[PDB]
Design a protein around this ligand. Sequence first.
Ligand SMILES: Nc1ncnc2c1ncn2[C@@H]1O[C@H](COP(=O)(O)OP(=O)(O)O)[C@@H](O)[C@H]1O
Ligand SMILES: Nc1ncnc2c1ncn2[C@@H]1O[C@H](COP(=O)(O)OP(=O)(O)O)[C@@H](O)[C@H]1O
Ligand SMILES: Nc1ncnc2c1ncn2[C@@H]1O[C@H](COP(=O)(O)OP(=O)(O)O)[C@@H](O)[C@H]1O
Ligand SMILES: Nc1ncnc2c1ncn2[C@@H]1O[C@H](COP(=O)(O)OP(=O)(O)O)[C@@H](O)[C@H]1O
Lengths: 145, 431, 432, 418, 437, 65
Amino acid sequence: ENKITRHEAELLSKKKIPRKLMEEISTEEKTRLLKERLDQIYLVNERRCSQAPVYGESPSELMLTLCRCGESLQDVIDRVAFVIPPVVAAPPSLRVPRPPPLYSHRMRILRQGLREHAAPYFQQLRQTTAPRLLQFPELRLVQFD
Amino acid sequence: RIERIGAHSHIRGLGLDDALEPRQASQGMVGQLAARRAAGVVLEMIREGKIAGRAVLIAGQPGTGKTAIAMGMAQALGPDTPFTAIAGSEIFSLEMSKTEALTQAFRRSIGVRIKEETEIIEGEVVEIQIDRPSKVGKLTLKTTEMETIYDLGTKMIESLTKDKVQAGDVITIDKATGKISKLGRSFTRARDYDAMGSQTKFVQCPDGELQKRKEVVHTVSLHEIDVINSRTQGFLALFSGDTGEIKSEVREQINAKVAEWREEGKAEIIPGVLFIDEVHMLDIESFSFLNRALESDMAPVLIMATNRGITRIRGTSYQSPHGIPIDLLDRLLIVSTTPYSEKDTKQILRIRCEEEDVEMSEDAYTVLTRIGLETSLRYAIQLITAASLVCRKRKGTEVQVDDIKRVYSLFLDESRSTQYMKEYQDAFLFN
Amino acid sequence: DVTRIERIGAHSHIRGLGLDDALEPRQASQGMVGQLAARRAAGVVLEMIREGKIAGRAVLIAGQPGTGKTAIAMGMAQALGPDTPFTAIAGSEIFSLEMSKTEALTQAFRRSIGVRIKEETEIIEGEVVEIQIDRPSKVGKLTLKTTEMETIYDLGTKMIESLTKDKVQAGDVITIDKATGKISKLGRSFTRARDAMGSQTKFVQCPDGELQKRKEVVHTVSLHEIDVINSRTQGFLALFSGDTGEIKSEVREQINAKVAEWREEGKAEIIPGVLFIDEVHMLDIESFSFLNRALESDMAPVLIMATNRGITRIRGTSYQSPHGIPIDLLDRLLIVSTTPYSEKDTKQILRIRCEEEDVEMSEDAYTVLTRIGLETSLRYAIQLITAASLVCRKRKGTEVQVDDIKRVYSLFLDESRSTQYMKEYQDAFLFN
Amino acid sequence: TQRIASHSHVKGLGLDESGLAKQAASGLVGQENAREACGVIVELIKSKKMAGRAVLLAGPPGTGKTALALAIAQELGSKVPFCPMVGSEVYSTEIKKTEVLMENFRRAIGLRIKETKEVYEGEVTELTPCTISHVIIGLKTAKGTKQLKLDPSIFESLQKERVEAGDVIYIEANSGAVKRQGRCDTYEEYVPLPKGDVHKKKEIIQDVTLHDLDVANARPQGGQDILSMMGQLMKPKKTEITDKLRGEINKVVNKYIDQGIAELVPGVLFVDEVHMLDIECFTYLHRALESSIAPIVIFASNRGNCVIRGTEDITSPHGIPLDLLDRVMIIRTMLYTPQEMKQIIKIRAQTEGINISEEALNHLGEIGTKTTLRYSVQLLTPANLLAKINGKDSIEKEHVEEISELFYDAKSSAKILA
Amino acid sequence: TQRIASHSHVKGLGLDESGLAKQAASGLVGQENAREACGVIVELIKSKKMAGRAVLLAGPPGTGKTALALAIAQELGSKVPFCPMVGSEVYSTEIKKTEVLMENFRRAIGLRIKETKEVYEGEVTELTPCETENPMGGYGKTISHVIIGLKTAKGTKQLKLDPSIFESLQKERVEAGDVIYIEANSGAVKRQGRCDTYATEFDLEAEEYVPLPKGDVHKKKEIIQDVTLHDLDVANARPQGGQDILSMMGQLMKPKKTEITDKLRGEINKVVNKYIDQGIAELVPGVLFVDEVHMLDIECFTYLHRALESSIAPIVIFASNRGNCVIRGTEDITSPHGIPLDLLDRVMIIRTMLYTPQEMKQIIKIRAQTEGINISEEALNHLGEIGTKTTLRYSVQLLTPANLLAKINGKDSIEKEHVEEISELFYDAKSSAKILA
Amino acid sequence: SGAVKRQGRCDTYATEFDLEAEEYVPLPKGDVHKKKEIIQDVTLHDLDVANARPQGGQDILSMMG
Ligand SMILES: Nc1ncnc2c1ncn2[C@@H]1O[C@H](COP(=O)(O)OP(=O)(O)O)[C@@H](O)[C@H]1O
Ligand SMILES: Nc1ncnc2c1ncn2[C@@H]1O[C@H](COP(=O)(O)OP(=O)(O)O)[C@@H](O)[C@H]1O
Ligand SMILES: Nc1ncnc2c1ncn2[C@@H]1O[C@H](COP(=O)(O)OP(=O)(O)O)[C@@H](O)[C@H]1O
Ligand SMILES: Nc1ncnc2c1ncn2[C@@H]1O[C@H](COP(=O)(O)OP(=O)(O)O)[C@@H](O)[C@H]1O
């Protein structure tokens, strides 16, 4: 059913907002290897919507306290946050017999892609969405003990 | 200054003596003496704060200070006690169910006060030396009583070097937190160099011993606790107000934990007050939900306002007194407001003139009072500042009754407007 | 041979609003027949649009169904020609699950207005013979030898990393952005092909002469494009997916300010357009209320509506009104009407279409079909023309004869025939 | 062997080459006027020289409208693109109705393309990174050796695909593909290195709808952009397609046909039971159909001149607005006679392979006439099963009397409730 | 410049200094009492004492009030902001109605932030320490302070720099031949780029050399800007942090609007009060105009009671041409202009009257001047008749098509026959109704 | 759970410095390993919900979810 790699006047990858590639397009199988690809990318040259973009302040006074009697932005957070979920569950894992190596390859490629991209901020992200699992009431208990 | 002279700026309280007898004039208020009595009783009971779930409604003619009564109440209450006023139409939202909105308002009204001891030191930056290679550090401080010298912590080293504090300054550090705060420069500190650098004022050297313990107290609302702990980094949503369907298990867990913190002297709760305007704007669903919303212990007193009479229940075809189903009606008591008298109107208008700081003729007072009585008080309140502007345009000071008639002619009133619309009914479509 | 996506449609027979230069509607021209009053008004409106000096003008077209109002709109839009912002849409599109109808109307208007813009680039290019790896020493062997010339230069660290990451090769043809220095990849040089190394990568020969050269370019974008592009980080893919929504009014105000600024600079030039909305009567009372004020705004491209109704309730209220439109919005607009065609006009249109179909029929069949269309409707005859052409092909004959039309008319009932058929036979079908 | 469906019996139209209708054939019978009425428009679609035509089938309940449309589709064949659609399904909760209508139109039109491609495979064992301007792999382990003009960057990029010895990749030179059949453990799935010239190819005929291309280019493919890696995970949403995109595709599509490689073929969109549409959909139907690229469309309904949805006060024939009714052609189907009842049941019985005593058959035909056709036909298989319990091969009168007594139609039920 | 708009002709209320109304001024006629009332309103706005007051205009179809509000704003000038509004805007699918109302009120209050600043600029000429062994003990290899030779286009100089700042300038890429942003009182320093002078001789210079600073080093003058506190709310409510993971996460999702909590509003109030009382900022409260108030529902009127009562609500105006119709949302309730009686009670009102045909002649003359199109008198009288029977706008639109027809004829002025063919071409309310009838 | 957590620093180092910020606690008085039973109680609703949205696990796909 063909690849349909041609078409896709969507990627805008070869940004080239000028159609100047039109000039080159106008200008054994070498002749075919040239002309066929020249047309194949000329049909892409119509993708000119990237540049000539016409782009274009910073009060950022401060994140004011939420009425916490002076100090704020951490003491309230670490004083109030105590909730623990009753239950924690692992993601479901599908059980299949010997699976195709092609799906394995694609999913593994995705597994590669996710890191590096996330690596620089993977750590920063990992500090978050790690819901607390337990607490430890301090010797403030000694009050009633 | 952001404020501006408002319709209800003249209100400053309720003007009730110690025995709760209203005074014929006090903190900008007079009239409805029975209403003032009842409101004083309500405020007293709120101070008592020994009971929950009570509710009360105010009914009467429109434009008879019901909102003014409520605002005087809120003013006299004080800032310590939490308070919140909202409009019936505001609950209807496209982000959440109405019941969740009512729960959010309720939890907002109530407040919690947390008490906790502190441990801090503060003094001059007598001298500091840092010894980058880890970093070795030595430092000393002092106060108006004695002086001391201490080593320097590696994390203390990072903290201070990021603070980039200058020797001779006055600062305070907490041991447990290890977070420093500059509290204003000192004579030697800001004596600075020959080099310009900057210019600044000074602060007095601290006193007493460096270490001070000391206790700090804070306050937060129940809804705030709910939101902050709800999504685990739902904290920023507090401002965005994007909180949705805060689950019930969270509510009960917070209730349990707050109760147990409470009975152990850790903190003290405070029963807030919540006022809803145009309560008739609620449908039957909200009536049903709030009807039970009063049994939960965390029940701030409610105050409602509406002037209707035997009106269709919102969302149905049933006429009821003020359009509120009898089930609620039997759960609360009422207060009525009468239309004002003659001389009291003179007093009110004189008070508003004082508010505006525009002092004018006596005949003007008589004529304007009679006109307002005949038409309405609100139109008189509108005419006050208009006449002031006209007279200032005359370049004189004392507004004259002729000027009052001029302005009155300039701005037709409700009765005149309908009389006009009658003068040519076909002027405007859909009659 | 080659079949186009386009084929005979309800207005394929219309090329343009063929009419006299002096705005004298010709009896017949470019498929425009009859309704010379409407044609005259349309010519005046078209030309006053062409001058484009008064904004916020509303034109409404009233009349009967199947009187060519859509045909007139198509003809005048054709006359406007390309390279001029013209937009047509139905009244049902304002309703969406995402953006309130107000913002839908605003986006429609912003689309209607069009703009043009030009700028000079003055970029460098050529063919690098080679580059020495700047071993640390940003001295790149910028041997950008065009067919005539050559030179060498430095090579900044950003430049070195750009060349490396793009994995450029020596003896390649590449063009270098002047200010940005972006290595706009272009492939390799003719040294292989007019050796020739064949693969997936594109191949280019060597350019000539001045590596630095100037190139003035122009662009055209409705205000909608600027709004969406500046709406967020990646508004372009929002356009491609058409899934944007609720662009802040503040953004649009800023855009209006800055586009004016560029305009008076001599940078930008406005190209106002015409907006046509069909079946306005299916538009809410909110739509009319909002259009009352939207037009009064300066940037108000002219508007065209369409309807045939008489007195109808306003959608959202129980007030009957002319064409089911509030009187309030009418007094801003003008009324253009039309009347049913006569015998000869119907005959001429039927011809026009038959020739459009490239079909041959007996003159007597033409006349009897004219009769039938007169009694029944125009659309019935229009459809029957192709139907009978196909039938007569099945006959293995050349020209359409009257018997063919009689047979085809027997085959398929018109509106009235089946309407009455149910009228006596309503007892059979379901729900009346 | 597949499950037997209602309309499986139909196979065509039974119309002589002249177009005249045999009384019964190909699984159809009766309604010759309609049968020849539909056949001609089938050949109209075969013409492919027109667009925007509209037809509507108005018949009483169970007069074969669904059968007629399928009969039309069967005569058309698979080559013709058919995309059946539903009147009531338009009301959704994802995008407005007009978008759905446009989307259905778009996938009605199908496009075929043709090409061919000379490949590489087989010889894979040896693998050298060699940096030379042309393939120096000397790829020869099964049949022969080959050389090609690929630069050093090509070798390494290929070597970047963890390519190992003798694992055949269907690397189409035009593509430079890496279609690794897989590693044999010897390096035990064995990549069978075929003999003959490694240069292999085969013609390919590919058919694609315009709607699928539209969706294809409406959103990013995700994998292309590292900032679009998450493109995959987000729940996939269907969003309105910007009009310019459809305008743009039409431009690019037109180009390809001009290049003598793309060959369009208009399709037919069937909308059943149109009388469930509201007024607003009708309105957009007017303008939508006007498009000079609108494909052929066929409606269906049996409603009378009852009120129109949404309008809540106006009635029109089949609840279709008069203006819409004007611009749509009409065909009608009448009732049937007991003789056709016998004949239809004979075909349904034959298709199901069920034998009926002639006495039983005629009596059942009588029962169906008492109540209806559809109810009678439903009873076929049950009775056949009664005979199975008693080992009887064919169906008899006693079984039918048993079946009918057991169940009760709507007509009888109507009186039963009272 | 601009294609003529429906109100471009108007340029000012044109009230005499005494407040009285010149009969015609900057495109106005009649309604002298209305003009004087608008004068009083602009006086009240300039007073700035009052707060939360609002008016409503009652006038027949053919709004006109558009012109009155526009002239009010024009007299107000640009010193104070002002925003329009249309009733349909309230019906939004992203935020609740009251959210839109409170937001539009918030955007109507402007502000003016005045902030002074000081910096030292130039090109780094040299750099030296002030070495001294005086410090206690140790090999006396110590720097008392640094000496930095800086040059602007004005000239060159050097200043005394404390020892600590050398570490800072290490942090930045400080090198001979580049310029820097040395905050005098704070000590902020940056590295713009190398002096353009070097690039001058450069045949290729990929980098972007900063030019040489001009003027004295000791200056950064006073910065100024204005905003609507709604923009402040938008900026502060959602922290920007475009680099953080959360920023990528946001750009994944489609940006939208969130119902901003009221505590953020109260906090904005507090902080702006703190800035203003220090004199840093300046508030310029605006006024608001909402047309076809009749298009609203009961919810919004009831909420408008609360919004108006507030002591922060900027002045606002409305307009309606609707009679005693049934209030939307309300099944039956009818009131003048579909406004509840209670809301009507606590608002002002002004009225407009019908217009006499002579006034039509005057306005038409003004409009012909505006378009710059000469008119023959017979056209004036004929169109006066037309407007007499028709409405004003109907007669007004006929101007440009007729002018154009005349241009086709080669004429310049429009005449009676031109307007005759224009009249037959297009139909009025009654003629269009009859032909419909 | 794999839950990982810190309890400040050991009490051995209660003297190295004098103003070091982080606190100190003493060495545990029990074995490194210990396993104790507990009468936990939960509703079936919470079981369902905890399974439905897998906050557990640590894979990056799960984290993104
Ligand atoms: N007795 C009074 N003393 C002082 N001010 C009053 C008195 N009665 C009314 N007012 C003023 O008039 C207004 C009356 O409005 P109100 O009746 O409270 O509105 P609503 O009917 O919405 O409750 C108040 O805001 C107050 O400023
Ligand atoms: N004067 C005319 N010349 C050519 N075609 C016409 C004319 N009047 C009507 N038509 C035909 O009528 C068809 C539909 O007309 P349309 O614009 O839909 O009428 P209406 O606007 O009343 O629905 C068009 O395809 C057009 O070919
Ligand atoms: N001449 C015929 N040949 C074959 N089947 C027929 C014939 N006439 C009617 N039918 C049957 O009648 C049934 C009608 O079904 P359907 O199309 O769903 O109802 P309707 O035709 O009312 O829309 C079909 O199953 C079809 O097989
Ligand atoms: N409804 C109205 N009431 C009073 N005067 C009006 C009205 N409409 C227009 N006018 C008068 O017409 C002149 C121009 O207003 P115009 O631009 O026509 O407003 P609109 O287009 O909204 O009717 C103004 O001088 C004004 O006095």
